[PDB]
């Protein structure tokens, strides 16, 4: 069983930014890729024309207009000097849904066939959606070539394009593989439900083509919830099946980026895929998560501490600007003027010159926070801004990246918990202390009726020697990805018999609350990869 | 008497098994003496018990952590200079420009030392200058002297909130947060006259020492 049954209930699609990167012309909001405004595009690009006859500065502008108006499909690149249309036709087919694939290019006046050797179900899907069949293609066929025709086009499509004009066409010769054929998907020809996987959009495909790494669904719904990939498909840590050719090809296809680690013909039309990849390089890049038992300086530049009076009530996580993430129960609004923020220090009794202290300006506690079940135990701390400084900057602190999806990390992943918590035998600790823990797949057995998987996350050590005690509340549960980037996965919420085995610490799943934080701080400050 | 090889301070060791508000003992206090080398001198880059900058054999300045209530920890800024090295020359017509450093702490964060840059200028007995923060160019304090006492200076703040402080302050020359400055002219061991200037001042909101040196 290569398909994860649990994930399928979430009905993830290609627009689910928690499972797949958004296109350059979209933005991830409330866990869904929402299309950008044509204004929002980067101004570097190539001029193009749509089927409606309007010219656009960049390809992504045309794609955004596509995302609002479906009838405004891309037609050709460059200026609209010529009025040649882009049409596809099927011939020698019993049913209008099937037939030999023939394409009439915008700049060519002769309808002529396409090669069959480089023909896949992705190109078939694109051809069928271009013909008007919203549910795409059903199958693929290679028929014999016309002896009177010696020329054909090899076509390459990403799988998300709306018309073949977005695909790349190359000059080719009729070879032994013949010409390409297609049968568009129809409800009457849909496979029986017994041995078929259900796409989100209603398309039915054979079970063997699900989680094979091949985009057999119209909206990719068959490749986002997988336990393993069939054939040559590459499996992400987040359970996404990707073809092998997308590995080590220079762009991040997996969410965590493991597809790009350990990496050492006459152009009939422009490469819109090359434009899309080129456009991706111009999106703003965020600099977070990279760094320049007791710990030392710089090992945790994101480590924040809130002081009430002369005692550190709780810990905190630096996010960027004047914003700090901390458990909700750690602070109260009524004590607004009493909290202090301490950074870049090891000993609270003996701070150094590098230590600086800031006051708290605003605290946001999650509205749905429950003080009994500790659900939604997150609070946002706004550091007091310097009146003569345009932007809140901490010269000696590096913010840690906030995860945007709950699928960034999996069970048993190595993560780091830190804080000023209590030592063994309740001894007072006067130095920042850091320990290692491992994530647990299930936690309802240890805390039945109280653990909430969507909002709370359980982690701990097998031996239980290293554990967060009282006072570690608000402390970070950080993890490092394949690229050594630090992500704050969780914040210390509560713990029962801290320091004992089988009683793991419970941390709120911060990735589930990315929308709330982003809407409270400004999305662009904390977001990476157009998310 | 000056002795850079044995300077008074306090070594405060925390109570290893101190309970949380169960007992009033949370650290132990002992008397210690240190030998200072040229430049800044300190013990732990993570938990320094003392910072002292030895500009010259004749003078040093810094602070040592101290407590009075046995429950809160405060910084005690102090300076010392050689008695024979202090210069008693006339300075009513003395002209120079001075560079140096200003360490201080606030009431709300007594244990946190804060660094600042200081700029000084003398022209014919008239004193002026400006104080800046380490990382940004905000005007924090103003040096304005007394016409009949170049050795004495009044200092007033110019910002509402000092760095590393949550306490509100009053601006202007008429602010109630002024304090007097006693300046000691120090000749360096190599024979340069009035090479260094030292002095310390204190208010109930903030307190510190001035470490100053001659540029030209
Ligand atoms: C916090 O959670 C507790 C536990 O569920 C809530 O208390 C119960 O809430 C259910 C909700 O249907 C009620 O049926 C019970 O009667 C409640 N019992 C008690 C003893 O309160 C509580 O209401 C929640 N509070 C907030 C503010 O979310
Ligand atoms: C976009 O074009 C402008 C115009 O000169 C140029 O300055 C800029 O470097 C270009 N940016 C990219 C990413 O190509
Ligand atoms: C997780 O724990 C719950 C607790 O009732 C249990 O029902 C479920 O089978 C467990 N899942 C596992 C062990 O995969
Ligand atoms: C951090 O970088 C080192 C450098 O070799 C690497 O070996 C290690 O795997 C990285 N950490 C993670 C979690 O990938």
Residue numbers in the entry:
A (entry chain A): 48 to 311, 322 to 349, 362 to 600
B (entry chain B): 103 to 318
Which lines from the publication concern this structure?
To obtain more insight into the interaction between PmSLP-1 and FI, we performed single-particle cryo-electron microscopy (cryo-EM) on the purified complex. We then performed symmetry expansion on the particles from each of the dimeric complex and local refinement to improve the resolution of each protomer, which resulted in a final EM map exhibiting an overall resolution of 3.5 Å. Analysis of the PmSLP-1:FI structure shows that PmSLP-1 forms contacts with the light chain of FI, with 1374 Å2 of interface area calculated from PISA analysis. Specifically, hydrophobic residues W417, L418, and Y499 of bovine FI interact with a hydrophobic patch on PmSLP-1, formed by A116, A120, I128, L129, and I175. A second hydrophobic cluster consists of F422 on FI making contacts with I142, I153, F165, and W205 of PmSLP-1. And finally, V214 of PmSLP-1 interacts with W411 and V426 of FI. In addition, this protein-protein interaction is supported by two salt bridges and a network of H-bonds at the interface. Notably, the residues on bovine FI that form salt bridges with PmSLP-1 are conserved only in sheep and goat (consistent with the pulldown results), which further support the host specificity of this interaction. When compared to the unbound crystal structure of PmSLP-1, we noted a loss of the short helix in the handle domain of PmSLP-1 in the bound state but no major conformational changes. Although PmSLP-1 and FH do not share structural homology, they both bind to the same region on FI.
